[PDB]
Each structure stands twice: as structure tokens, then as C-alpha cells.
């Protein structure tokens, strides 16, 4: 909506935003494969890449943060990848992108440098709630 | 879309789906506060609750899985909470819900019981990529 990506608006110097979400990633992906996936068309063009990893099952959550050094790199990646399928063979999930709310290598670095409280008891680690009966 | 929640369709016995996402949770929330938040109107009515926790900064990711034991409980919670603001005072984020893709306490339990590979090297733990210069 306010965060959907318009190529021509990057091309024309309007939309200077550099942080982007790669969405619909198969739950069955590693950071490394994502790197490799991106580096096919966009090697060297990004400041920051984090494929978000669930604390509990250590799967990815289906999206990643990437900050491109230059906004036009978004066009290179989008044209090449948005629309296409992650794996024509092993997942029906297809790739899409949108601007993140947090923008800029600097804020991204702080997001993940500073841990959050998880509970009032600091000895706690996240425990799913489940019941039976 | 295919997963948006229609109360009257729960009420009428059409939509038997029980797994739901609580969305737009402030990054600044704990599982416990979520439990407490839910238990205000829906104590005792759910099988499964997991507020998704980022492996790296140990923040929540802005959403949680909840499986209600009975589909009408979704109406109780939605009417009470969707639309309202998590914290009228300390976050402009407001609460919304939608059906999850994974449905049912049983599949949810397996999702999080079985760890995923994170890398080909099993000694690896998720490392953000960042560069400067």
C-alpha cells in the first residue's frame, strides 16, 4: 500500500528508500541459500541481509530484511525475481518484495543489536503454551 | 482474502477453522502479556498460543499463533479486540486477526516440535550479514 514498490519511482529518483522485504520465502530455506539466491542477480549490492529465524523451531519465518546500497538495485532484483517461483519444483510459493517500515542499514543494525525483554523473569526462555483434554 | 475472518460464517457453522493469527503486536510485548491480554475475554478457550520470537534480538515478530478450542471463541475475541489499540497510550499499533494457513493444534505442535536445518554446517548459528565502506 504505502509500502508497495514502484520501479519507475525508484528509477526517477523519487523513492530513495533502500530497505526491502523479501516475502513468501519457503519455510524450507537457509540464509546461505538466500544469499546465493540474491547474489545471482545482485551480488555486492547490499549492506544488510537477515533471514528472520524463529527462536523455537529455528525455521525461517518466510521473510528477510535486506538493505540495498543503492535504490536502483531494487529494480534489478524485482524484475528478475518478483513473480518467479522460489523453486518451480519443490514449493509453490512465489517471490514478492515490499518496502520495510524500518529503513536504513543504521536502524536495522540497532534493531538486532539490542535484545528485548522476553519476560519479567530474566531466566525465562520462550515456551509455547499448549494444553490437552 | 481467502483467510480473512467472517464472524457470521463462524456463527453459522460454515467456517470450522480454529487457528488464528493475532497481528500487529507491538514489538514491545511478552508472551505473558499476550496471555494476559487474551485471558481478559478468552481465558480457558485455547489449545495453543505462541508469540513468535526472533532468534537474534529475542523480540517478538509482531504476530502470534493461537488455536481456539471452539470456533465461536474467535467471535468473542475479535469483537472485543480487533479494531482496538494494544495500548492507547504507548503504541499506535492496533489489533487484527486472520486465519492461519496451518490449522489445528496437531499440526501446530508438529511445526514447532521439529527443528529445521539452518545451514549445511550444523555448528552454524544465524549470523546477520552486514558490511561497511
From Swiss-Prot, chains A, B:
Disulfide bonds: none annotated. Induction: By nitrogen starvation. Inactivated by phosphorylation by ran1/pat1. Binds rad24 when phosphorylated. Crucial for commitment to meiosis but it is not sufficient itself for the commitment. May be a splicing regulator. The expression of mei2 protein is negatively controlled by cAMP. This is Meiosis protein mei2. The chain holds residues 580 to 712 of 750 of the full protein.
Amino acid at each position: 500500500d504505502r509500502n508497495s514498490v514502484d520501479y519507475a519511482q525508484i528509477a526517477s529518483g523519487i523513492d530513495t528508500r533502500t530497505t526491502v522485504m523479501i516475502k513468501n520465502i519457503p519455510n524450507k530455506f537457509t540464509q546461505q541459500m538466500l544469499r546465493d539466491y540474491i547474489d545471482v542477480t545482485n551480488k555486492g549490492t547490499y549492506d544488510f541481509l537477515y533471514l528472520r529465524i524463529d527462536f523455537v523451531n529455528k525455521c525461517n519465518v518466510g521473510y528477510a530484511f535486506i538493505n540495498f546500497i543503492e535504490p536502483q538495485s531494487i529494480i534489478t532484483f524485482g524484475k528478475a525475481r518478483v513473480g518467479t517461483q522460489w523453486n518451480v519444483f519443490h514449493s509453490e510459493k512465489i517471490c514478492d518484495i515490499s518496502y520495510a517500515n524500518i529503513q536504513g542499514k543504521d536502524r536495522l543494525i540497532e534493531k538486532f543489536r539490542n535484545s528485548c525483554v522476553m519476560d519479567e523473569n530474566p531466566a525465562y526462555r520462550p515456551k509455547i503454551f499448549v494444553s490437552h483434554g
